Symmetry: D5
Subunit: 139 residues, 10 copies
């Protein structure tokens, strides 16, 4: 029953800061009732998100997210049953990680990948999860 | 011969505070002589209980409990020999786990299951045990 | 939700070949619709039985069996989720293990226990399951 | 790069044998160019399918499949990188598993689940995988 | 010459007195050092549980002498095997009495490892026996 | 209760005769089967090596009776522990004698598990004792680990 | 000191069957004296090779190979100590893997990758090694 | 694609402190843009270097390094995918290890090798990695 | 008294000839049985590789005596450790020569475990040494 | 090629503190250039020593040591490749372990063997190693010939 899904996506070219906010707010409104928790990362132009909850709800949320016009080319990175949650304190939270980010954040990206800018297509599922767990500790 | 049994059951629709007090008083009277220790949670309408002791005593106790008119449809979740007890401090303790429960407790439910309401049907034996271990810590 | 339960019980002194056949017919009548499979051994006066199927069904069947006048003092030996069935070929089958059994059967009894009569009380869960597995492959 | 996705779905109530022939024809036409292999099972009313190929390809194929009108409520059971393929010999194969199937097949379904009828919602990723591997071997 | 450990349990004769246990301790503290024996004895009326460590020949000589003692019967070897290192090396022998008058802490410890609050070795496996003995040694 | 194995060695008294060995084995055959004891006794003059398997209470009753026997001394428990299943199918009615008059096959077997072609339990570990005993039971078709 | 090195590279655009022959002949000439064994696959335009031998020899051979004007952009996929050889019967053997290959070979390529064309740059070390073992097996020679 | 390569080299006989500084300057200039991290140890006349980064980049850098006239006889000690970086705080750092090194440093060299002087071409992958990690913490 | 194995390599003197190896074998086959020693010797000019099995004391007596032999020098103990059971128990000693004129099957076995077709014990670890000696024993 | 060799031997009857001092002086002279480290214990009449270094060096040193007229009947206890040294701090350390040793040291002997007197023949290689590691941890100085602990 308890499941996790990690996926990456391509946000549309002309995304603004307000759009990230619109996504965060919607997720923070819908997720609690569905028992969904997780963490969303935006590294222009890419999204990386982890979702935790029961299987039915994880799948409902995921398949509804894919219909969002603000991104395309979704790539499911990992989907499996889990023993326990790691993001249970957040309905959803949003972190931007890019070329202007601090050395501490850049060094985390580098720790799990080939460069200092976050590229989900360049990481396996273990590196994706670990990156997310570590970035969760910074703020 | 040292054993653990975890089960869940459906409490009757009528259960008042006094019924929970009666169960707890009975278990605290009977369990010490029988070398039984453990923990009972009530998440309306369901019970989740763990019992530890010598195999014959755990079985005697469990089969007596199944005859109780205050619940039905008992579902053994796990019954196994164990190396050492984990609930040795309590002949029996009883905890209500519901929507009125504290943030800490609700988050613990969420850690091991799809929602913030405790539903033993939604969890495997490992998640049941870990939940019970962690809530026992809180109490 | 796939589960196995193994228990032992004390059959009443009265028991005749026809009682075993009655039990067999009853289990072969009820088990298929309930998705239950397994194996019953009778070693005067002890029974040893393994039940496999969905959690809800295994429990309904088990708790029904305890109510049977023909045995008493049930002892759950193991109850746990399983990856796959081992006794799937029969809804139920019944074997008598005694001094008139084949040498091959007597040897299997001795393999997993202290005497050449099957006494489940003495046997741990791995010994019970292995005995049942071994005797099922000969029959 | 090399990935496998297993999912289940609900087929529309009015599915004919011609519809399964149709689905099979499209997948046998589309899958080779995209390097997709696997197996589809239909147990009325549900589908169970495994897809193998490079991550980008598996994702393209799956997300196209979910936007198909002949089924709904897709539930991804597992999506992960894999060491090597298991269904490489078929671009796609379609097997119907129901109450009319062979006793061999029925016993197989029962080996991995609570019942003789295939119900993916009741199965974990390992049980799904092994069922699909075993039924493929008998075909 | 190999380093060994033997854990066994036995039944004390009815009406063993605190003095008999003192006599057992005194003899063991006199004999064990010269034979290189270390370990721990626990008495939970009517039962004894003892662990002995030392060289194979000495552990065996000591054990088979102990079985001849009129103060207990029906000895049950729980485990006897070569060991990597001792755990009771600081004591030639110690004796601990565990009953219904022992501390809440001790009683909880007995319960952690077995089916009741009185110690019944015949019910515990070798790993439970050793770890109980290790844990009880630690608090005393 | 629990299934157990015990392996021990001892020193036969100096002047032990074939009739004495026969008497021991006649006793063993009389008692062991009824008591659910399987295993084998080996004699490599002047030493004995035996393996007992069965219920813990029974293995212990049998062993402690053996230690009181005036025909041997200085018994050494080599191993005693719970086991998952038996490795000996029967109580072996015969005595296996292992000595300088043994067959080349048997001597090579002794050598396989120890420093010499004569069986010396004091120089073997529990695994070596167990495997030697299993292998020789197999050679004598008494046998074969189920 | 026994080692394996697996790498991939880009063959030159103007590569001909004759060049494949010269490489194989040079390899068969040099490899025995240096204790090198292994296997070379060519999937236009890519080479995939495994080399086994003493670390010093594997490294001498590898670094000489990278200087060859017949390929560029070498990608070491794995280099590590090994317990025993897996390709000891061949000093060097060459196999072309393409669209004219047997269906059995095509199916083998698919078993370890996304497509029926061999693309080394899309296979992890375990996949490369297992592909090469399997393909050596379906072929023959010593 | 995240990789690590460890190798050893023989520096030319004539190398001066200025040559080492030139190597370091070049590497700190080039490595960042290529996402390369690591550590270089010089134990006259030998080099031992660890490189981390994307497979393509590690390989580009490595093969460029082998073309350098200041060293010869390169020996790849290990090259493999990695879970995460261990260097990463450094584009590149250089440490000289010799007869004038600290007692602590000489004892570390001895801990991993036959002598107080580092002989890179004599240590296995595990010894190389751990030596490098250990000496990184000392400085 | 512990059962032991020791594997070592050495350098034979330059002028060694077939008779020398025959004298080594005959001496080994004479001495080893009474000492309970088993094993196998390979000579790959100029190198010897030998495995010895037996009781710790005897393995050591034999080895330290072998090292005093004028027919070889620079001995390198490759491994020495207690063992669970013997693998060469059927031979007091055997001697095998492995050279550039051995069978291809033997030369390939050499190659399976090392950098070359000539046996060089210095080029192999304890596992490769043991496995080679086991495999070459089986094919003889 | 990093190796460890542990052996025991019987010292000749007459050995004096000066003989032990001579052995240590010799080992501390030779071991450094050979990259050898380790630890020697003397429990009259027996020696127990562990040597670490490159395989060739451990072997050269060992076989030279067996030629020493001050001991006989050497018994190799274990000889095998190692991943890392454990005795790297001293080219050689030497400790007398006997019945005039401290209770702390006697308890260590008992921890790994039948008695409080060190008898290498009564210990398996893991016991020898761990005993040597534990004694290395509590000493100190390069020897206890001048001052104990
Ligand atoms: C990258 C991305 C991630 C999203 N994650 C979530 C999510 O975690 N939970 C959620 O409810 N909506 C998520 N959404 C937003 C939903 O797609 C959609 O806007 C929402 O269902 C609309 O809810 P509303 O109509 O109540 O505002 C995400 C959107 C984007 C593009
Ligand atoms: C869910 C639940 C849990 C119970 N747990 C225990 C228990 O741990 N021990 C016990 O003796 N009785 C337990 N009981 C109560 C028994 O069923 C029964 O009422 C009690 O043992 C009667 O003893 P008394 O008549 O002496 O009061 C439980 C009952 C319920 C319904
Ligand atoms: C030891 C034993 C094992 C039994 N096993 C089963 C069983 O596997 N399935 C079942 O339906 N009934 C089993 N029963 C029989 C039931 O207790 C009961 O007789 C049966 O449900 C009556 O069904 P019927 O009215 O159709 O005959 C068992 C009874 C005994 C004593
Ligand atoms: C249960 C199910 C499984 C399907 N599996 C595949 C598949 O494996 N590959 C594929 O290309 N289409 C698959 N489809 C069919 C596609 O959704 C759809 O028919 C296709 O994109 C159009 O094919 P066409 O070329 O015939 O128009 C599946 C459909 C259903 C409902
Ligand atoms: C349960 C129990 C444990 C004993 N433990 C030891 C022991 O560890 N060491 C010992 O020498 N005697 C032990 N004995 C005592 C011996 O049986 C016996 O009294 C002793 O050999 C007599 O020595 P003494 O005559 O010098 O007093 C134990 C006795 C009992 C009943
Ligand atoms: C070395 C040796 C091994 C023995 N093994 C057994 C045995 O396994 N089982 C047994 O009952 N008696 C065994 N005994 C014999 C007993 O000590 C005792 O003599 C015998 O059980 C008496 O039984 P009886 O009165 O029927 O003759 C053994 C004796 C010796 C010396
Ligand atoms: C992809 C490829 C693989 C090669 N493999 C080997 C090899 O395994 N062994 C070898 O000696 N040369 C190999 N070479 C050839 C060498 O680079 C080089 O041509 C060789 O040293 C020439 O030797 P020769 O002058 O004696 O002919 C390979 C070349 C290519 C491009
Ligand atoms: C032992 C050694 C290690 C080197 N490491 C690196 C390195 O990590 N990164 C790098 O870019 N160049 C490295 N080089 C230097 C390159 O070979 C080359 O000199 C340099 O990249 C030229 O860059 P520049 O022209 O910008 O100065 C190394 C050279 C040597 C001899
Ligand atoms: C490489 C080599 C291996 C040897 N192996 C053995 C051996 O296994 N057993 C043995 O007794 N002597 C062995 N020797 C021979 C002894 O060194 C020595 O010649 C022997 O003690 C002479 O015995 P003899 O005087 O009875 O002939 C070996 C010698 C060499 C050089
Ligand atoms: C038990 C014992 C241990 C020894 N350990 C070493 C050693 O670790 N290193 C060493 O060089 N010599 C060791 N020796 C000393 C050598 O046998 C020999 O006396 C010494 O190497 C001669 O060197 P010197 O002439 O410079 O004094 C040891 C001797 C004994 C008896």
């Amino acid at each position: 029953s308890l499941y996790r899904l990690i996926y990456s996506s391509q946000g549309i070219p002309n995304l603004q800061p307000q759009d990230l906010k619109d996504i965060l707010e919607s997720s923070q409104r819908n997720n609690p009732a569905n028992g969904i928790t997780g963490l969303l990362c935006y590294s222009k132009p890419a999204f990386l998100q982890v979702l935790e909850g029961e299987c039915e709800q994880v799948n409902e949320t995921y398949h509804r997210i894919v219909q969002d016009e603000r991104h395309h080319s979704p790539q499911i990175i990992e989907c499996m049953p889990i023993r326990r949650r790691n993001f249970e304190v957040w309905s959803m939270q949003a972190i931007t990680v890019n070329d202007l980010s601090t050395e501490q954040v850049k060094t985390l990206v580098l720790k799990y990948s080939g460069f200092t800018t976050l590229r989900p297509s360049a990481m396996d599922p273990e590196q994706c999860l670990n990156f997310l767990l570590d970035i969760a500790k910074i703020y």
